[PDB]
Design a binder for this molecule. Structure first.
Ligand SMILES: CN(C)CCCC[C@H](N)C(=O)O
Length: 325
């Protein structure tokens, strides 16, 4: 009850990033978190986006939850918001035609929700909590098998030959041809990271062809499209979003990248058209990091208070790891 945004702003002569700068999903604070400790469900592996696993609610905190990969090590646990599009209710993969990576010890054929729930004596999280159940409209113009050019987010200076390999509700999965699946990332039509076939060519940018493509220097889209019999995502399907309007020094709240259980008071350290650099007030600049303006883990001031999540105040002066802020 002691720390408060109101007096911090007066003390610092600062301003917060207006709620209007965030996506509705990042700002909404009046939804109830119906998830309960022990409930089971399905979800994508954040580090291997094309794979689906059985997950359990290991912890609830405000509008967030910590999920655990059944049968596996706790080191894989991760946090998501209750309105996350990356989780689905029990039975979702079977209904949508997706494959499942069963719990440790199980074979994909030995898994059955009904029996599993009995063996574990648990309940499945009710369906009415999921925003994504594949009941909504698919992304206009993006179908499994189409080709496009996309930025490798792990190596962002590369624009590469890619394919759509999955579609779930209003989002699709970008995959880099002949490269490892862990480079995949879910995306939507307004993403600034995707471009139609030929973009690089009109921009003078070098295009990164499929891994080990014969005579990589002579890569030709027309040729590749004939070889694969695949079509390119149509140009009209791409509807890139406008650059965000966050300004340097605006304050907000952001999940700690080192200990995701925590959320800290933060400031906009720097900006790009679609990214912002986060600085945790009072902490060393060595911890500042870049992040997409639409990332689900940044929120407007007051989010923690309204959702019931603890908020870490600025680090005290002269403390270890601090910065004369
Ligand atoms: C195109 N992209 C999906 C992969 C780029 C990999 C770069 C480098 N060989 C590495 O392995 O880090």
């Amino acid at each position: 009850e002691c720390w408060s945004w109101e007096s911090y702003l007066e003390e610092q002569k600062a301003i917060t990033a207006p709620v209007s700068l965030f996506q509705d999903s990042q700002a909404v604070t009046h939804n109830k978190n119906g998830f309960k400790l022990g409930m089971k469900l399905e979800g994508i592996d954040p580090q291997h986006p094309s794979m689906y696993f059985i997950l359990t609610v290991a912890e609830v905190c405000g509008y967030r939850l910590r999920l655990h990969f059944d049968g596996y090590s706790e080191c894989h646990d991760f946090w998501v918001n209750a309105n996350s599009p990356d989780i689905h209710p029990a039975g979702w993969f079977e209904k949508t035609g997706h494959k499942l990576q069963p719990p440790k010890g199980y074979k994909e054929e030995e898994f059955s929700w009904s029996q599993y729930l009995r063996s574990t004596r648990a309940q499945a999280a009710p369906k009415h909590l999921f925003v994504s159940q594949s009941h909504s409209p698919p992304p206009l113009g993006f179908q499994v098998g189409m080709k496009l050019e996309a930025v490798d987010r792990m190596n962002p200076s590369l624009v590469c030959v890619a394919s759509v390999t999955d579609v779930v509700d209003s989002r699709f999965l970008v995959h880099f041809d002949n490269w490892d699946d862990t480079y995949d990332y879910w995306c939507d039509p307004s993403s600034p990271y995707i471009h139609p076939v030929g973009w690089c060519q009109k921009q003078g940018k070098p295009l990164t062809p499929p891994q080990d493509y014969p005579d990589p220097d002579n890569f030709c889209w027309e040729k590749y499209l004939e070889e694969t019999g695949a079509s390119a995502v149509p140009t009209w399907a791409f509807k890139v979003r406008p650059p965000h309007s966050f300004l340097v020094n605006m304050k907000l709240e952001a999940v700690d990248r080192r200990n995701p259980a925590l959320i800290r008071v933060a400031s906009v350290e720097d900006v790009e058209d679609h990214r912002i650099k986060i600085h945790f007030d009072g902490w060393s600049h060595g911890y500042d990091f870049w992040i997409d303006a639409d990332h689900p883990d940044i929120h407007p001031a007051g989010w923690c208070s309204k959702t019931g999540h603890p908020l870490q105040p600025p680090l005290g002066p002269r403390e270890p790891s601090s910065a004369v802020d």
